[PDB]
Every structure is written in structure tokens, then in C-alpha cells.
Design a protein around this ligand. Sequence first.
Ligand SMILES: NC(=O)c1ccc[n+]([C@@H]2O[C@H](COP(=O)(O)OP(=O)(O)OC[C@H]3O[C@@H](n4cnc5c(=O)[nH]c(N)nc54)[C@H](O)[C@@H]3O)[C@@H](O)[C@H]2O)c1
Ligand SMILES: Nc1nc2c(c(=O)[nH]1)N1CN2[C@@H]2O[C@H](COP(=O)(O)OP(=O)(O)OC[C@H]3O[C@@H]1[C@H](O)[C@@H]3O)[C@@H](O)[C@H]2O
Lengths: 253, 252
Amino acid sequence: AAIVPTRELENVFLGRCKDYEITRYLDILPRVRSDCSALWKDFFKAFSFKNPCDLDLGSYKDFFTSAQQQLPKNKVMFWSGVYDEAHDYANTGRKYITLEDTLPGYMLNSLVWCGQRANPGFNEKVCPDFKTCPVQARESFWGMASSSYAHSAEGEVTYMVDGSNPKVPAYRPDSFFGKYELPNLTNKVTRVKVIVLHRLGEKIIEKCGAGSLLDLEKLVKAKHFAFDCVENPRAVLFLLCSDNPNARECRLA
Amino acid sequence: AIVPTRELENVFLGRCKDYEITRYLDILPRVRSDCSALWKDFFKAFSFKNPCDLDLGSYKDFFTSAQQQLPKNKVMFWSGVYDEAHDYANTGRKYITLEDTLPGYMLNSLVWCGQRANPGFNEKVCPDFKTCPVQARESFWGMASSSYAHSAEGEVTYMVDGSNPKVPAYRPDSFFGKYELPNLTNKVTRVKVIVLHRLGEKIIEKCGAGSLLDLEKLVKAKHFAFDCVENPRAVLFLLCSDNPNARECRLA
Ligand SMILES: NC(=O)c1ccc[n+]([C@@H]2O[C@H](COP(=O)(O)OP(=O)(O)OC[C@H]3O[C@@H](n4cnc5c(=O)[nH]c(N)nc54)[C@H](O)[C@@H]3O)[C@@H](O)[C@H]2O)c1
Ligand SMILES: Nc1nc2c(c(=O)[nH]1)N1CN2[C@@H]2O[C@H](COP(=O)(O)OP(=O)(O)OC[C@H]3O[C@@H]1[C@H](O)[C@@H]3O)[C@@H](O)[C@H]2O
């Protein structure tokens, strides 16, 4: 019913922020104008002195306005259900960008924090489990993060999905992609390129042009973008094969 | 002459704090010293001295403060193959590299040097990696390698470039040759060499020949077991991911 928050949240935030500013993605993403301390103030204002369950999509809006970078054309990737594979393939910004390579994504990835009403306005020892909050509160931070990131995409965007999960459709309207990313693609986007990941040794569940992927195809087209879809394209298959080289799908000529 | 990192202390302390609270928590222990104490040891090694006035001892206190116990069988060394080895080690999930440990993570890619005048480090320019004598040029990374190799236990892995016509896969004067191999202790049981044959490039070096034979001789003389493989499938597949039309990557 509870989760342990990250210790020294301000120090971690500011330390990640300074590391990023001087050393990370230097030739891949631009620097943000606001200094780390200003970004901290915006971040801490969004959630402090508020019950976690009262947050909503607007809570972190000003922080994301300050933190948002212009993103390289054609390079933005979204992912659903395949965090490791999508990040491994995107290769720390070198092939695609993910939210986690952007400043706000990088500063807060993996961290846990919570406001409270009593002083000092946040809790550094215990946080309620967020499943108890309404969905707009639970999704307050990462939901706005995704919206702001998607809204900055231009050119082709790529969406990597799990095609091997019989319980979770490749495309779902209520996922972060469906709820915060796709609806925020602007007319600067030209094409949605879907990569369907079929895990090695698992029954194939979803296929391009069928089920939820056909629903997605229709929606992308109704939003006036080009669309393509590939299953385990060679480059991704080789990546899966590196972690399971003796899988039947990885046999050499 | 090369460009020093801006805000060196802010970056060191920011990476130090990030690492302390959030990085490698399930694979490497925390160190006892706080980030401000580690800064103090690091800074005193080079500060208020001419930028070449260093030797292997200069960062002794920093490295002893920063050294972590390392996961048995998980240590990797590398020469000439930065991206491939780091990609394969996969930020500590499969192997550890020096760059995943606290001191390697903090200083990786940074540039700094001392000067005599206040503030005791040069924020404008640092010497090219060739103007200082060898024991000074290798002072920080040499001792990082020494300390790291000395903490290795069980099987260790070494990835080398077998496709470089100018530079042997193994050299006694590389960091591995000079600082790592000689610091492997009796807790090490086996040196496992992985030879990278870059895709589409001529093979220069192979297991059981050339400098790999020299290495095998030395490893055995230390009573460690030895094996060597060229482009083992897991590594080949990683290479292929970035170049899937290469002839080495044709599938059944
Ligand atoms: N992260 C690092 O900067 C680093 C630097 C030096 C040494 N390591 C460690 O020694 C082993 C790799 O050095 P070594 O065996 O000499 O391999 P390389 O031949 O690839 O050289 C390693 C780094 O050394 C850099 N390099 C570049 N120029 C110089 C130089 O003039 N003098 C000098 N001593 N090193 C230089 C080069 O860009 C490489 O990134 C490895 O197992 C790590 O545990 C890591
Ligand atoms: N804690 C984090 N959460 C999230 C990041 C993130 O970096 N960290 N997220 C999302 N997110 C939240 O974590 C899950 C993963 O859902 P999952 O079902 O795997 O995929 P979604 O489409 O819901 O979310 C992935 C989407 O938003 C970023 C990243 O840029 C991807 O393109 C999702 O349901 C949200 O509740």
C-alpha cells in the first residue's frame, strides 16, 4: 500500500540536471534555456503541498514548458510494453530519441516522489501507492511528459510495440501512446512507423494489418499521416538474438 | 591542446550524487565516503601543480576511497573496442566495465588538468594527450585500471580488436597490458578473451596466433585458465544489428 520515495530528491534532480547540461546528448539534443535551479523550482511547485491524489494533467504543465527541447526531425520514438528493447534499439539517442533521453525524462526516470499537504510539502520517507489515486493523478507527471514530447515531434515518428502479449493488445486507446502521444502529434508529423516486436520463443499474437494494429492503421490514416508496419525487422531481430543466441529464430546461413 | 570540461566540480558532484542514490544499486555496493570527500581526494591529486606533474601515485587516495567490491565473474576489460564492449556489457546487466564503477562513471569523457596558479586547475586549456610524460598521461586512468583489476574475482572477460592492422589485439603497453593483467590476483580464475572481427573488415588477429598467443602464454604463467573466441554469436548479433546487410549476418 506504500512505496519508498527517492532520498535527496532535490540533490538527485539537480545533479542529473547538471550532468545532462554539460555532458549528455551534446550533439543530439539542444540545451534548455532555464537553469537547473529554475527547473527545480518549477518541478517542486507542481506537486508540493498537494495531496498526490489531487494532481491532474495540468499540474506539471509549466515545468514541461520550461523543460521541453526541440526534437530532431524523424528521430522521435514511442514505445509500449517493450521498454528494454526499445531503448536498446534507440541506442542512447544515436538512432532514435526516446522520452528518457530528453532532459525531463532523464532527470526523473526511475524516481519516486510525492507531495503532501503538511510541511515540508513532500515526503522523503514514505509515499502512498498511487493505484489508490484517480487515473489523472497517477498519470499527472508521465502523462504530461508524453504529451509535451509527442507535441514536439516532427517528420517520421516510430512506435515500437509488443506483439507477443495475449493479454495486452499492441495498440490500446488507454495506453500512454493512445491517450497522450498519438492525439498530440501535430501536422508537422508525416508518418507513423510501427515496429511490432515478437519475443523469441513466444507465440506471435499481433500482426501488422490485423486486430488492434489495423484499428491503429485506420486511426493514423484518419489523422492524415502516412503509416507503415513491420514485424521483427532484421536490425531488431539481431538485437533480440544477442540476448538469446541459441533461439531457433536466430539460426545463421 | 584540448578543451577542459566546464564546471568540473559541479559535474563531478552531480554525477557522484546521481550514482550514489540511483545507479547500479542491484550490482555494485555504495562506497563509504561522501561526494564532497571524494571531490577533495580527486582534486588534491592534480591541483596547484603543473599539468604534467603526475604519476601513478597521484590519485592513490581518490581511488582507494572510490573502490567498490566487484561482482564475481562479471568483470570485463577492453582495448580498442569501446562501443562494442559497452554495448555488450550492457550497463552492468551482463558484465561490469570500469565505466560502470563509481570512479569510472564520474570521470568518463571528462577533461581536466592542474596549474600552479590559483584556482589550481586550468579552465582554459589542457595539454594534448601526448605532451606529458607517460606516467603522467596514464596517472588517472592507469591507477583507475590498476584498482579495478585488483578487485576482480573469478572469471574475467577481455574484449579486443582483431581487425586493426596498426595495433595488435594485445599489447603489454596498453592499459590492460600495463595496468590490468599485472593486477589480477589469485582470486581470478580464468581470462576469457573475446576477439572482435569487425564486419566487412580484414581479420588481422586470431585466437591462438600473434599477440593472442603472447597473451595466452602470460595468462597461463599466472596459473589462470584461458579461453578465446572470435565473434561469439551474442557479439556477432550485436554487430549485425547495426549492419544487418553485412555478409557475416546472412540468416538461415
Ligand atoms: N573510460 C576511459 O577513458 C578509459 C581510459 C583508459 C583505460 N581504461 C581501462 O583500461 C582498458 C582500456 O584501455 P587500453 O587497453 O589502453 O585500450 P585503448 O587502447 O582502447 O585505450 C583506452 C582509452 O584511452 C584513450 N586515449 C586516447 N588518447 C590517449 C593517449 O594519448 N594516452 C592514453 N594513455 N590514452 C589515450 C582512448 O580513446 C580509449 O578510450 C579497459 O579495460 C578499461 O578498464 C578506460
Ligand atoms: N514510470 C514511468 N512511466 C512511464 C514512462 C517512464 O519513463 N517512466 N513513460 C510512460 N510511463 C507510464 O509507465 C507505464 C508503461 O506503460 P506501457 O503500457 O509500457 O506503454 P504506454 O504506451 O502506456 O507508456 C509508454 C510511453 O510513455 C513514456 C514513454 O515515452 C513511452 O513512449 C505507462 O502505462 C504509464 O503509466
